[model samples]
Target: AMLPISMSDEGDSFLVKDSLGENKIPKNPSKVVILDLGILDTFDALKLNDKVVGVPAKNLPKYLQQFKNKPSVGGVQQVDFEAINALKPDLIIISGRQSKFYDKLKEIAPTLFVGLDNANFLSSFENNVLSVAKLYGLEKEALEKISDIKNEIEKAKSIVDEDKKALIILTNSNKISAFGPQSRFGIIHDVLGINAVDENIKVGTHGKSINSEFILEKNPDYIFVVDRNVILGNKERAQGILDNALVAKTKAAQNKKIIYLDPEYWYLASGNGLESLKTMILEIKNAVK
Candidate 1:
């Protein structure tokens, strides 16, 4: 038998608030529909994949391919109300790209927006994880996973050179953007304690548009590249963009310290998943060592 929704001190059901408004979640959501890849990452890390009844079919990471056969609720920004309604999920989870659809999604079930705070990602992510855990009666598991991630972060930080400065660049077909402490990928600089070669880099949801000349000017000791196009299936374009003479002269290039992050993990799933965060930490640890 399915578990009932939890009750608060007031004797009513427990409430969880998201970007939209307060939602009453079931203690054990057996049928769930997920719209955000980041939240999907978290669910997968929590081993709650079996509870998911539907998901966005496009741009699915390889790790989540097991759910490809599940019902497709639609793309991240677009929702197939009919498909979702047919599923009749007990709960719905969304974030980032799917946040705008919260109103409509609420009509289907209890929807939660688990998006991250760009200015303070780690803390926000931890809170979201714990919130989800409470809804599923998995608080202990969630806390353990979080503690494991903290330990991994410390281990990764230990190997990184404190004096070395790093730059995070996102590359598309021919376009490039740089991210700093307050940007979407700020966890590298803020949580990992990596010093940004140019801490004043412009901040935005999509990062600050920049050119190879800017990279040359900063000349960081290490470079971390997130290839957006590659994640979308256009590979090698980022390598071509960063092979310019100006960028080639940087200390990162000269010392072969350029680290190409897995766009699938970095761009698609770097929000609240324990495994995703661990993958990120592992990549940095390997690069530093």
Candidate 2:
């Protein structure tokens, strides 16, 4: 019954103000087209999966793999407007990746954007979850789930060592990049209170480019790796890729602290809603020891 999203002043058949702007979305949308996996994750978290009519199901995350059988709209970056239009969804929910086609998408149906503000990871995530819940009249349940996650995060935060510096890395087959508190995968350090070894890692879409020398140079206490190949269905995983002498010489390697994060949550799905965030925290808590 209560949430952060607001309704129009003295108006019906209208509500919700998110990163995308105030739009009149259908109450209790029955046929929804999802362009963002994170938002789809939110739907799954609320047990509203039956309402989804279409999705970008080509390369869904591991936890969300069951949705592969659902009708395919297209890939995340490249969508098929024809397929989506065929569904005639009452509402279309999207994220930053689909912002470019907002005008064309809204023409088909009332589009709702739930992009995450990486700077305010926690608040942005919470707001997005609640916003979707309001549409389905699941505000109370959403509140309980979100509260449970916050408590989990608190427990995870207490277990982590604030002084111990960590490095977050993403590898695409062979190439590697580093992330800090402001990047896409920054939730670890940003929300979990872990101090990044390189405090100045630049904020960008692809993360900072570096070589094996960089990992050796930083020599952080913990090494967190998210391999892009897993989602790509490549034969090579991040474990085999990072098993070189340079990475082995670091403190993390010496103590076997190289945490290979699940690409599903860490790479493909996060910051959009709650379940992924909870999985992320739990993964960190369990791996850090």
Candidate 3:
């Protein structure tokens, strides 16, 4: 039998060390369960959709049709423990933020805690992608995907004028949150060689909530809004945020540069990463015309 080799760096020592005695790549995770939809998307992108046995029941984007046949374990953040164990998953992937079920899930199968911080969205996204790739023995595919995104970002940067500034905001329950330098949206700007107008936003795990007056003050050239409740079949909840007059006075409103993304795709399952980045670039590129 061939001895298992560790390919992770010193920084990833902890993750590797934890699994030092176990097989890094299972022959076949016939009954695999992922608590986070981001992992579902990652598996879909890697052509391993068949390996996923359970995921959230929420309506998935058209691109993820491959996993439509999979059973639902409940919402990504909220899991139904009985449903998960009933599926008899050989491997269960759970995120650390989900404290309520983590202990219980560990008892069901060999569970791996995937940590993600919303503040450094891009880095967290990349790390998550890499984590999935490692689990599936698809490191080369992950690197290739990263390269493709880098190329696309460079192309986007070349086409857009340098003076343009963009902002990515989350809209939910009539609340507005801004993501700036060091935030996931900030990472998108950094990658595209563009700028996020809100530089003072803090760097941390949770997003910083700001009022409409603050948004008007930041005044970005382009605004990307992720409406939380709207995509979940709650149109009424999304109405107030779009109708707010203060939001209307911003530069994005005046120029009609506001781009609304599928909340599930952009914010929910998006920790799979770059696929949404491409979607955002295409939307902004088309809108800029």
Residues 143-252, candidate 3: write the lDDT tens digits: 89877876766677677757878777887676777777656455456655567676677864446787778777777888777777765566555446766787788788
**Which ten residues in a row are the worst by lDDT in model 3?**
12-21
TM-score, predicted candidate 3 vs. hidden true structure = 0.79
Clashes of 2: 0
1-289 per-residue lDDT for model 1 (tens digits): 1112233422334576555577777677889888767778778878888998998887677877878898898776567889999999988887777766778888888887777777777777787788778777788998998899899889877877788999999998789998988777888888888889998887876788999998998889989999999666675578889988998899999999888988878887765577777778778878877
Provide the clashing-pair count of each candidate structure: 0, 0, 1
lDDT of each: 0.80, 0.83, 0.65
TM-score ranking, best first = 2, 1, 3
Ranking by lDDT: 2, 1, 3
Candidate 1: Cα lDDT at 183: 78
**Winner on TM-score (2 vs 3):** 2
**Candidate 2: which pairs clash?**
none
Q: Which of the two, 1 or 3, has more lDDT?
A: 1
Could you tell me every candidate's TM-score relative to the true structure? Answer: 0.92, 0.93, 0.79
- Runs in model 3 deviating more than 4 A are 1-25, 96-100, 116-127, 203-206, 231-233, 237-240, 284-289
**For candidate 2, which ten residues in a row score worst on lDDT?**
1-10
